[PDB]
Amino acid sequence: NPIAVTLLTGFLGAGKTTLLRHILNEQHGYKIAVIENEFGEVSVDDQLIGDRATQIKTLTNGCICCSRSNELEDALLDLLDNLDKGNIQFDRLVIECTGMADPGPIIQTFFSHEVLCQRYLLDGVIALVDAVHADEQMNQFTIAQSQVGYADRILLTKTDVAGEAEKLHERLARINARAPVYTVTHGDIDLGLLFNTNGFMLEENVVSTKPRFHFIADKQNDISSIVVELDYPVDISEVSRVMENLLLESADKLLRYKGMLWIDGEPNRLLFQGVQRLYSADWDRPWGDEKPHSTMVFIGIQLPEEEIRAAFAGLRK
């Protein structure tokens, strides 16, 4: 049974420490291995060093705390080794990629080798956003917007003290039109919100937040989403060439992208998804009585929206 991997990202907030302190110490009933930057465990049961020098600590609550070098593969493979030998037991893996950490390279690690593809299965990317400092952090650091862009789910905290932050709701939507935004106004972040996002599965509803007309404000950010709607079918060969040219032109620019396509002559939905250079497609549920259409979303920095829309517009007969 594949291990469910969750990436916890977002800028330096106080809420991240509280969440990590809850996984490592309290008894929540989850079997979680954690790769973090700091030190929140106050009850270390045992400890072992893997074949690749990975420091693996077993905690009293059953959970595991794990360190990482510059090569994440080492920690991942050492966790599997000691899992197979019954040294440790865990069902979920939570990796902290907060601060200046790029979620990109971490995601790609879980697709690098065949063994990691089979033994690990990415769940989703969770972006923690502090409503008080979000705008400032995103204005100064590109990586702050990027972490939001990679997210399958955005947890917006401290809105009770940030005041009227509807403008922030919009800005997150312009950056990431895929991820729903969860706004916790009273209480803390539930641990279960990190899991079962289904973010790395083929979706038919790729766009959660419908785009609104704000020309003078929808060009502020550097990372944005491009939502493309087609009410016409396209040739599977033609659209395949367009995508391959598109994904290569903006290779370094694209964070994540998903879409549902109406293929000319095919009675089934064609779904696709991708992260940077890695992309995959597959057929799905038949159209039936539902009116056929195409819906795609491209998240990235400095995307050539004009060229992208024009390319899809030329697929019309």
22 binds Zn ion (CB under 5 A): no
Q: How far is the CB of 199 from Zn ion (least distance, A)?
A: 21
Q: Which residues between 98 and 117 bind Zn ion (CB under 5 A)?
A: 112
Could you list the residues that contact a copy of itself (CB under 8 A)?
A: 37, 68-71, 73, 97-102, 104-105, 108, 111-112, 140-143, 222, 248, 251-253, 275-278, 301-302
169 binding Zn ion? (CB under 5 A) = yes
21 part of the interface to Zn ion, by CB under 5 A: no
Q: Are 195 and 121 in contact (CB under 8 A)?
A: no
Rg (CA), the chain: 21
Strands 64-66 and 181-183: unpaired
If phi over 0 gives left and psi between -120 and 50 gives alpha, with beta otherwise, what is residue 15?
Answer: alpha
CB of 87 to a copy of itself, least distance (A): 25
The answer to whether the beta carbons of residues 97 and 106 sit under 8 Å apart is: yes
Q: Is 13 annotated as a binding residue?
A: yes
Taking CB under 5 A as the rule, does residue 65 contact Zn ion?
yes
Q: Which is nearer to Zn ion, 65 or 144 (CB)?
A: 65
Check the CA dihedral 290-291-296-297 and report its sign. Answer: negative
Residues 165 and 171 sit within 8 Å (Cβ to Cβ): no
- Which CB, 71 or 231, lies closer to a copy of itself? 71
Q: What residue 253 binds from Zn ion, a copy of itself, none (CB within 5 to 8 A, per partner kind)?
A: a copy of itself
DSSP, collapsed to helix, strand or coil, labels residue 21 as helix
Return d(Cα 293, Cα 297) in angstroms, integer: 14
Nearer to a copy of itself, 52 or 293 (CB): 52
How many CB atoms neighbour CB 316 within 10 A?
A: 10
**Cβ count within 10 A of residue 210:** 8
Total length of the chain: 317
Cβ-Cβ contacts under 8 Å for 71 (sequence gap 6 or more): none
- Kindly state the smallest distance separating residue 57's Cβ from Zn ion, in Å: 7
- Between residues 209 and 276, which has the closer beta carbon with respect to a copy of itself? 276
Point out which residues bind Zn ion (CB under 5 A). Answer: 36, 39, 65, 112, 169, 185
Annotated binding-site members for Zn(2+): 36, 41, 65, 73, 113, 166, 169, 186
Annotated binding-site members for GTP: 10-18, 160
Annotated binding-site members: 10-18, 36, 41, 65, 73, 113, 160, 166, 169, 186
